[PDB]
Amino acid sequence: DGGITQSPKYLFRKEGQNVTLSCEQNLNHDAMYWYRQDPGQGLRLIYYSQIVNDFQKGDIAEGYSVSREKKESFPLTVTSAQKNPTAFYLCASRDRGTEKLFFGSGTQLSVLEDLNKVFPPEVAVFEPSEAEISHTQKATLVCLATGFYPDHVELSWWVNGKEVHSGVSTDPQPLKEQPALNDSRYCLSSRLRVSATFWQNPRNHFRCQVQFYGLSENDEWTQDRAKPVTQIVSAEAWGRAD
Amino acid sequence: DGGITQSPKYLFRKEGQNVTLSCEQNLNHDAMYWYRQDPGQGLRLIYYSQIVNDFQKGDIAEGYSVSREKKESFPLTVTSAQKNPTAFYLCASRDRGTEKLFFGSGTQLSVLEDLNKVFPPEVAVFEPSEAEISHTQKATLVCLATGFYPDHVELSWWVNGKEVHSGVSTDPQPLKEQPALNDSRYCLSSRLRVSATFWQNPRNHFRCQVQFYGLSENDEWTQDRAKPVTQIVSAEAWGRAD
């Protein structure tokens, strides 16, 4: 409804590769910004643009470039010269001076050379136990997202076609399936709780959806297995009348 | 945030089959209603419930049954006795008397027997022409949903993982691929328009998603081909730098 649109939530950058993060707004704001979140001092300005064709460097502008051909777009390019390991890039827009800034959803740019360890997740849904149903009169569906790398996923639930939020408890973050090993894949779980009668109607549909942010179409795939491109992996279940 | 949840937007009912449409609300309303939309007089009350365990018939209550075991749920059952062809069922809740009614999203119940012709759709996305790009500086992605039956679909667009609405023009309704023939499948199209520079960034992802409301897990599949169950069919494309 008129906001900021930037690059996907997760992106890949191979050592010595040029990547551009889009950023567009339909708020007719003159000023736009690009920040990088450094664990040390939080948000830090990379570049800033007051009006079309103008851009002022920030303190960490070393390795990045921007353009402002049009008022709506302020693309940030992370050049191969950029030696940063991985970071969160946030885009923002405002009127000017010291007015209110509007922020984009943010993007994590993960830097790595090997794409051998990249894997989409497998998703499964487990029905509520007959014991929970006739004790709490509630039904809990469990979703397990497993064996994916890196931790580039977003899980959501869809009941009868619409995404739901209430009754949903998802882990705050994916966890290594084996913290011990380093080249360990991640797993994530979530629970959706609905009324027992709602779960017992055979016409009710339940779907766990996991968006995986993986390799792009252009990114070259060396291995034999199907390339781990951005994709959606789902698991679904219909209501089960007792 | 606190509303009504009813059966999916589209449902199948075979001749002489009993179907139940769920309806639940977490507004703690005492009164709940079920309407049927008849092209003739618009919304008409089927059943009404003032408080737990009580339900008053409407004028068209012939062929339907309802229960009100709990305050939150008011399930409507369309019995095989119901001789209606296809209709829109809307659920609502209120405090009581003549207070304000809150409406569910609605459900179309399509009646048919040749489950032989039920078909999920095929989805394809076509890139913008290099001519449109360097003339309008805009890019238009086209999505074609084809060969599905019945017209039980919802199309949406996903840019970089987030569903978008602006720049989206979708047909108001699916059209028969051959109005002539009766057992004709449907098709639907939609266009998503983005800036040329946005489409030229190889890191930008575009996905056309079509939710098909088909057969349930329990519904028996006689044919040989994979059963046309509820599912999601997508087509995607990445940005193409000129």
How many C-alpha atoms does B133 have within 13 Å on its Cβ side?
14
Find out whether B24 and B34 touch, Cβ atoms under 8 Å: no
Q: Which ranges constitute the DSSP H helices of chain A? A: 130-136, 196-199
Across the interface, do A197 and B69 touch by the CB < 8 Å criterion? Answer: yes
Check if A198 contacts B (Cβ < 8 Å): yes
| Longest alpha-carbon distance in chain B | 67
Across the interface, do A197 and B11 touch by the CB < 8 Å criterion? Answer: no
Check if A223 contacts B (Cβ < 8 Å): no
Cα R_g (chain B), whole angstroms: 22
Task: Report DSSP state, residue B10.
Answer: E
Chain B residues closer than 8 Å to A162 by CB: 105
Which residue of B105, B198, B218 is in closest CB contact with A202? B218
Could you tell me the domains of chain B?
1-113 (2.60.40.10), 114-242 (2.60.40.10)
What is the resolution of the experimental data for this entry, in Å? 2.7
Tokens at A114, concatenated: 């090997």
Check if A24 contacts B (Cβ < 8 Å): yes
Query: Side chain identity at B154, as an amino acid letter?
Result: E
Chain B residues closer than 8 Å to A195 by CB: 24, 72-73
Cβ neighbours for B32, distance < 8 A, ≥ 6 positions apart = B23, B25, B48, B49, B68, B74, B91, B92, B93, B94
Pairwise CA distance, residues A214 & A118, whole Å: 8
Across the interface, do B166 and A213 touch by the CB < 8 Å criterion? Answer: no
Chain A nearest C-alpha distance from B10 (Å)? 9
Which residue of B6, B26, B161 is in closest CB contact with A211? B161
Closest CA to A38 of A84, A78, A106: A84
* Angle CA B200–A229–A37, to nearest 5: 70
Check if A127 contacts B (Cβ < 8 Å): no
Closest residue, chain A, to B159 (C-alpha): A8
Closest residue, chain B, to A166 (C-alpha): B1
Chain B nearest C-alpha distance from A102 (Å)? 18
Count the helix, strand and coil residues of chain A and give each as a percent rounded to the nearest 5: 5, 50, 50
Pairwise CA distance, residues A53 & A47, whole Å: 13
Experimental method: X-ray
Tokens at B23, concatenated: 């309806």
Candidates B107, B125, B127, B160: best to mutate against A (most CBs of A within 10 A) is B160
Residue B216 parent element (H or E): none
DSSP symbols for B31-99: EEEEEEEETTTEEEEEEEESSTT--EE-TT-TTEEE--SSSSB--EEE-TT----EEEEEEEEESSTT-
Checking DSSP bridges between strand B10-13 and strand B107-111, what pairing results, if any?
Answer: parallel
How many Cβ pairs within 8 Å bridge chains A and B? 111
Task: Report DSSP state, residue B149.
Answer: B
Chain B residues closer than 8 Å to A238 by CB: 216-218
Closest CA to A188 of A226, A144, A228: A144
CB-count exposure of residue B131 (10 Å: 0-12, 13-18, 19+) = exposed
Pairwise CA distance, residues A241 & A201, whole Å: 6
First CA to last CA distance, chain B: 44
Chain A residues closer than 8 Å to B24 by CB: 195, 198
Chain B nearest C-alpha distance from A180 (Å)? 32
Q: Give strand pairing partners of B110.
A: B12, B86
